[PDB]
Amino acid sequence: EFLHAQEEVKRIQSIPLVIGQFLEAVDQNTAIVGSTTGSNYYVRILSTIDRELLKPNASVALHKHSNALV
Amino acid sequence: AVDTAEQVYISSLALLKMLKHGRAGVPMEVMGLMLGEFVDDYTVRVIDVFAMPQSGTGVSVEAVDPVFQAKMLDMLKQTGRPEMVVGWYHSHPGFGCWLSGVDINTQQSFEALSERAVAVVVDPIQSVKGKVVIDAFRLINANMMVLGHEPRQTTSNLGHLNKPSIQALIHGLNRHYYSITINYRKNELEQKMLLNLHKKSWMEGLTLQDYVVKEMLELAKNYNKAVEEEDKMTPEQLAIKNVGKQDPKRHLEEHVDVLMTSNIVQCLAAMLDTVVFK
Amino acid sequence: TPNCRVALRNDSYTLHKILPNKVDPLVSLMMVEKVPDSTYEMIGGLDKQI
Amino acid sequence: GDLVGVNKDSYLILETLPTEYDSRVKAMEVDERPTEQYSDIGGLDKQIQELVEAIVLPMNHKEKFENLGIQPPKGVLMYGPPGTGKTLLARACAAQTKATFLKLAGPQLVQMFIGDGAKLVRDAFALAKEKAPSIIFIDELDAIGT
Amino acid sequence: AVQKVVVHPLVLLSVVDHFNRIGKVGNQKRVVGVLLGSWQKKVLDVSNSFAVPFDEDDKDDSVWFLDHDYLENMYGMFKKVNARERIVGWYHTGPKLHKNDIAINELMKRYCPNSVLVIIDVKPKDLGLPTEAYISVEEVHDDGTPTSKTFEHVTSEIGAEEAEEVGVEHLLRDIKDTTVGTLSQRITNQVHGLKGLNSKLLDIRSYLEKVATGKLPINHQIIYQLQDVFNLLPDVSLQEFVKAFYLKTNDQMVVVYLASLIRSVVALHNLINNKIANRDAEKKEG
Ligand SMILES: Nc1ncnc2c1ncn2[C@@H]1O[C@H](COP(=O)(O)OP(=O)(O)OP(=O)(O)O)[C@@H](O)[C@H]1O
Ligand SMILES: [Zn+2]
């Protein structure tokens, strides 16, 4: 059931996505990301990779409605 | 006077045209009609759902053609079951499927026609497979603000449906509305073949059909070797030494268990030599 | 504090956390462009003037 | 083209609708006819004939021009130390000739936003092709021509 | 024309829910309706449909009637809501086809150039991917019969769509997905011998029955032809692998080598790191 829960988090959000610009890592489990439109968004990061691909400034894909960091 | 919490029995056939007719209107919102039978106050069943013409100019109460239903009910008589109409439904794919400004204007009109006229919403976007999603609601009369405003008895079927409470604007419509419980009366006859038709079509088509050799293992060895040193530098990174670096950090996953299953893929696929042949 | 960066929720549009901002780093970065550090060990010959 | 109507997000165009655009750019000024006539100038009868000719001759006398190969004048430079009664005499000649008058000034073509008065002639002379004279009168051409 | 068809679980249910409609009132025959196809290409797809009252007499085995007032105006209904959806043919639950089925398709060819019939199954039993599909053509015959109209089998496959897996795949909830790479491929292997060699025995007994009785089918010739394509390797005694013998283990060469190489270092990752973190907590606590 936990391995089935691994398919859950990998299912979200699937498609589609929107590009966004990462600004800085404020704390654990969440970080702020500027949208392509320019509005900075504060989004809970995905529980898988919190560190190595974060980077101070990078372009990170976001979900349409939720703008989720993946 | 006496109002009891309603239970909605939906048929697996009625579930089809909810998402299917809703998919045809995507992205735009549609307007449907619910078909079923009223058994009593505390339970209700929807035995059928049919498609209604989608409105490209926006949903209105006049989008439902009365001669469309009058010609449909006559075609339902020659059909096996001619059951009376009950209520309406509408898709809302573009957002979190909440009752809009038109949905409340078509409420007092439909609740005058039929007693309950349960408001049902559905959205494709929230998930794909393992979530009910959809939505449902029932208008609680604003004229009742003089009387007791907190139905219903037999609470938590609402109260539990009141979880998660689904953000704010959704439950912001809990003023003048109350949702309704959706459970599935067993179709399992059809639901058993629903699993059999789905998994058999997904099992190698015959189970036979499906049942870069050393090179796929030469590409895998780059994941089974060249990935090792970037994985096995981390224990030397765990050696500080010692100790100025912030700990603990666990690099054991996920490559170790992936290369495990990577052999599980390659070993049983190589067993096809011993399995298929002899 | 004013001018400070803050997170914003979607629904109630409130501030979820407090975030460190940069105002002095803007200026000070332009200040470090024009000159290096240049301490006493980086200066000499002016001892009469120092 | 442009200007056509289309319904909300359905994106269907029912009919192709004219004409052009926009607001005061389409019609600079709407003038019916002045309260005065060309008879209001004394002693200028010598130099009004040159004026009255160039405007009147392309209308009534056009049939005689195709026979003799005559080309009517277009622009006319009317200048004198003020008051010369130039603007009263100009517009007054459009009253008896039924010519529709359009009021325009040179400095009126300058706005904050660049590319306004320049796009106006694209609209103005397009109406000069669409419409028949009538007439168009402007003032302070010397300053704007600097 | 029509090569393969795509049958959704939604439209197939539209035949199944009508089995509850006329199943309670009975009596004879089966469920029959007209099929609404979605044709974007040579591959055929089906989204929705409408079930029509239908009956087929026994005596009187050639008697059949669709209700065409139900077919006409209800088409303008589904056409108004869905412009792409149109009738590509008809369907029924079978299980088999009586000879009268020749006349159902030829009547509705005014609606569609070629009407594809779909035989479905309301109760899943055997042997595999269910239902069936036929196409109406005329092959005449080699023996010289008058022009013979016989429905040729069309391969049927299930397919999915967006937003339709919401309620469908939810209600099961009991399936384990999958798991790809361990059990998924091996259960098929146990079945690939079962389902592979059972039809082997069922047909080889009917092919022996040919000489006995039931001749024709002669067939001819399709039976032995592709059987001889199966004969590229028989494989019979013994396996004729003298050229494939050293190659047999040579395909297992690197698969065993990597399995030996990965488990060595995976252990070094599992064994070392476990001992480290264990004694750090264990002995430093007490
Ligand atoms: N030579 C003239 N003939 C007739 N009227 C005149 C003459 N000179 C001046 N006037 C009178 O003086 C008044 C002032 O008009 P004025 O000549 O100042 O306009 P204008 O200078 O031509 O305008 P603009 O500067 O826009 O060209 C007019 O009402 C006009 O009747
Ligand atoms: Zn609506």
How far apart are the C-alpha atoms of B82 and E5, rounded to whole Å?
32
Distance between CA atoms of residues D123 and D21, nearest Å:
8
Q: In degrees, to the nearest 5, what angle opens at C-alpha E14 toward C-alphas B50 and E171?
A: 90
Q: How many CB atoms lie within 10 A of CB B266?
A: 21
- For residues A9 and A37, what is the distance between their CA atoms, to the nearest angstrom? 27
What is the CB neighbour count within 10 angstroms for residue E110?
8
Neighbours of B118 (CB within 10 A): 24
- Identify the closest residue of chain B to C13 by CA–CA distance: B168
Contact across the interface for A7 and E179, Cβ inside 8 Å: no
Q: Is the Cβ pair C12, B167 closer than 8 Å?
A: no
Sign of the Cα pseudo-torsion (B45, B50, B53, B55, in order): positive
Please state, in angstroms and rounded to a whole number, the distance separating the CA atoms of residues B14 and B22: 13
Distance B98 CA to ligand 2 centre (A): 9
Query: Where on the phi/psi map is residue B154: left (φ > 0), alpha (ψ -120 to 50), or beta?
Result: left
- Closest approach of B233 to chain A, Cα-based (Å): 15
Q: At what angle do helices B66-78 and E68-81 cross, to 10 degrees?
A: 140
CA distance B232 to chain E (A): 8
Nearest residue (by CA) to ligand 1, atom 6, is D85
Cα separation of E114 and E89, whole Å? 7
Q: At C15, which amino acid appears?
A: L
Report whether D106 belongs to an annotated binding site. Answer: no
In this structure, the residue with its CA closest to atom 22 of ligand 1 is D86
CB contact under 8 A, A42 and C8: yes
Which of D35, D46, D88, D89 best tests ligand 1's pocket when mutated (most atoms within 8 Å of CB)? Answer: D88
**Separation of E162 CA from ligand 2 center, angstroms?**
21
Q: Residue B8 corresponds to which amino acid?
A: V
Which of E21, E77, E86, E29 shows the shortest CA–CA distance to E54?
Answer: E29
- Distance from C-alpha of E199 to C-alpha of E219, rounded to nearest angstrom: 17
Tokens of A13: 């959000």
CA distance E160 to chain A (A): 16
The CA distance from A39 to the nearest CA of chain B, in Å, is: 21
Q: Determine the Cα–Cα distance for residues B79 and E26; give it in Å rounded to an integer.
A: 13
Contact E137, E152 (CB under 8 A): yes
Contacts of residue E49, Cβ cutoff 8 Å, sequence gap at least 6: E11, E14, E15, E33, E34, E35, E36, E91
Pairwise CA distance, residues D141 & B182, whole Å: 80
Q: Atom 1 of ligand 1 has which residue's CA nearest to it?
A: D84
User: Which of A51, A65, A66 best tests the B interface by mutation, with the highest count of B CBs <10 A?
Assistant: A65
Where along chain E do its domains lie? Answer: 2-182, 223-282
- Rounded to the nearest angstrom, the distance between the alpha carbon of D93 and the centre of ligand 1 is 14
Name every chain C residue with its beta carbon within 8 A of the beta carbon of B168. 11-12
Burial class (CB in 10 A: 0-12, 13-18, 19+), B49: buried
Residues of A in contact with C7 (CB under 8 A): 26, 32, 42
The first and second tokens of residue D79, run together, are 């200048």
- The answer to whether B125 contacts A11, with C-beta atoms less than 8 Å apart, is no
What is the distance between the alpha carbons of residues C24 and C22, in angstroms, rounded to a whole number? 6
Q: Up-side HSE of residue E46: CA atoms within 13 Å toward CB?
A: 32
Q: How far apart are CA E77 and CA E87, in angstroms?
A: 12
Lining ligand 1 with CB less than 6 A are: D 41, 44, 82-88, 139
The gap from C-alpha D83 to its chain's centroid, in whole angstroms, comes to: 23
D8 interaction partners in chain B (CB closer than 8 Å): 56-58
Size of interface A-B (CB pairs under 8 A): 6
Neighbouring CB atoms inside 10 A of D141's CB total 12
Q: How many CB atoms lie within 10 A of CB D93?
A: 20
Resolution of the structure, angstroms: 8.0
Q: What is the dihedral of CA E159, E162, E167, E172, to 10 degrees?
A: 40
CA B198 to chain centre: 17
Q: Say if D and B touch: at least 3 Cβ pairs within 8 Å.
A: yes
User: Residue D40 has what DSSP assignment?
Assistant: G
- Does B103 belong to an annotated binding site? yes
Ligand nearest to the CA of B94: 2
**Dihedral (Cα; E193, E195, E199, E205), 10-degree rounding:** 60
Which one of A1, A4, A15 would you mutate to disrupt binding with E, by most E Cβ within 10 Å of its Cβ? A4
Compute φ and ψ for B101, nearest 5 degrees: -70, -25
Interface test with B, best of E262, E264, E275 (most B CBs within 10 A): E262
- Work out the number of other CB atoms within 10 angstroms of the CB of residue E8: 23
Nearest to E131 by CA among E113, E150, E146, E153: E153
Residues 6+ apart with CB under 8 A from A7: E177
- Preceding amide of E252 cis, omega within 30: no
Chains E and D share 3 or more Cβ pairs within 8 Å: no
- Cα dihedral E166/E168/E174/E175 (nearest 10): -90
| β-pair partners for E269 | none
Could you give the C-alpha distances from D21 to D126, D131, E51, E255, in angstroms and in order?
11, 15, 56, 76
Angle at C27 between CA C25 and CA C29, to 5 degrees: 65
Experimental method: cryo-EM
Task: Note if the bond before E28 is cis, omega within 30 degrees.
Answer: no
Beta strands across the sheet bearing B7-10? B119-122, B85-91, B32-37, B43-50, B7-10, B181-184
D82 CA closest ligand 1 atom index: 21
Contact E176 A7 (CB under 8 A): no
Which residues in E101-201 belong to E strands, given as ranges?
A: 116-119, 134-138, 149-153, 155-158
Q: Are strands B85-91 and B32-37 parallel, antiparallel or unpaired?
A: antiparallel
Q: How far is CA E90 from CA B34, E15, E48, E120, in A?
A: 27, 11, 12, 11
B128–A14 C-beta distance less than 8 A: yes
- Rounded to 5°, angle at Cα E10 from E20 and A13: 140
* Residue B123: exposure state from Cβ atoms within 10 A (0-12, 13-18, ≥19): buried
